[PDB]
């Protein structure tokens, strides 16, 4: 049962980075090098592993996190980084064991006049934990006076929409991202590679 | 189906340790903070503290700091509440709850069903069943009152019926109270017409499974 | 600690009524305020967060408003499922704190309690303790007071009471108060009484007996 990787990488709709969704993958065989070779990938780094080696390995469970950002921010989807995305939207742990997959989707998530549906958290009073997810739309109190709901000075709606237009620069164009994380518990491994000892 | 399920009721003695659990499913357990809330008998809600399962970072309420330990085990999607020495004042219901998110109103959008913790020095003990005898004259008219006093038992589960299951109308079995002795006391009563005091007999059927006790008690004026 | 207050502490309402409950904070909390519902034997359920955001799955008849120190929960048309206790909870400061809750019982005509007093049983007296019971039957509203008198001397810290939940058929309450002494001091007095006050009683009523 080769897993539904196409269910995630080929999903017609992707989430905003602030409300990134996670797909638990389990009970299947994973052909990671076939995923590598499906190509059209501008970023494909693995931390602590190699694709070729890991489709000989198995793990307890695998998780696929997907969302949209833009080109200049994919660097933030790496361990130990800072910035609006890593600090306020999607944070990876320093001991990350997985791969980060990203590819330009300007042909799909941009439109003439701008696609404002993709959002990202602009303000947050503390940085996120690794793999924490905060979807709060409450107005952000940037100063010492309370907002009492109303938008006003020092009181901002916390989410900003990307201005995705087909004519933006490489760094301001949409990029779909998928982060695979490999969970090895002291428990039966149910996501194996074709070349593992299990198959 | 986001759900939190807590472990079952607990009956301990002062000075003992206790650990209770809260298992979460239907979502990414490491990605949301978990709160613990106390509700003492007949009281409201108290925020005890919070924990982030991803790394077990905890922030306690000052009232509970150093009085209890919040921990987690992400490998089995579980959060814990733990005491090293229980006190009678710890008798209460404890809930775990997920925070929709950490910032701003930080609302508790999904709760576990609660874990009742009872701290008492007493051991399993069957009840004493005493009559609450009516004194109303049978021909006086109006209503008469009649009951049974179920005293000094432990643990909590006790059931009482009247004339087997035949008498149910006008019955009020009250919630048990925990006496200063660490033993429960309960009263069951029924109101009946004064006239009927002269024709029908009344027997309460008290059942206490923990001590395998079954007592039938007639109540006469 | 921010202190949360709710008014009224108890509310009688009928199906179809528009009900409003208020919450007050001892200092401003912007709109970092949540509302929860709790029914006996159950765990709370989130109704409103951030003062006015309706939790998904919650019926539209619930709504929240307010800011700073004043907040209100409104139910447009009270339904049978809505009789319960409602708590507010501030999230402006740590520690988080809840209001004491406001129970919303079913409205009914006022009914005065039938009161009955029960002396200790001879069996119990053999064991060295005496339990005098006072019973308040089928009253509405919930508020009632029982004071034990022994030879016209009022008792304190001497009794425990317990109240039933609102009855399903007649929507009344019932209450049991248990005064307990030892055989010794029980045998030292003659008359035992419980005085009951209730909105349905024009003047306090006393049931009593003399051991003999
Ligand atoms: C997402 O969707 C794309 C497009 O459907 C997938 O591209 C697919 O890539 C595989 C090889 O990795 C192709 O399989 C081979 O294609 C040749 C075509 O000549 C065929 O003769 C071979 O027998 C074999 O089928 C597949 O055709 C191709 N799909 C299409 C319709 O072009 C991509 O792999 C998907 N990504 C994931 C992770 O699912």
Author numbering:
A (entry chain C): 334 to 532
B (entry chain H): 1 to 221
C (entry chain L): 1 to 212
Which statements did the authors publish about this structure?
Within the SARS-CoV-2 S glycoprotein, the RBD plays a critical role by engaging the human angiotensin-converting enzyme 2 (ACE2) receptor in the lungs, initiating viral entry and infection. Here we identify several potent neutralizing antibodies directed against either the N-terminal domain (NTD) or the receptor-binding domain (RBD) of the spike protein. In summary, we determined the molecular determinants of four RBD-directed neutralizing antibodies belonging to three different classes each with distinct features that bind to SARS-CoV-2.
Antibodies that target the RBD B epitope have been seen in other convalescent donor samples, but to our knowledge, this is the first high-resolution structure reported. Heavy-chain interactions form a total of six hydrogen bonds and three salt-bridges with the RBD along with a set of CDR H1 and H3 hydrophobic residues involved in major contacts, while light-chain contacts are primarily mediated by CDR L1 and L2. As expected, binding of RBD mAbs from competition groups B and C were less affected by these mutations as their epitopes lie outside the ACE2 binding interface. RBD mAbs targeting epitopes outside the ACE2 binding interface, such as WRAIR-2057, WRAIR-2063 and WRAIR-2151, were also able to neutralize all SARS-CoV-2 strains tested, albeit less potently than WRAIR-2125.
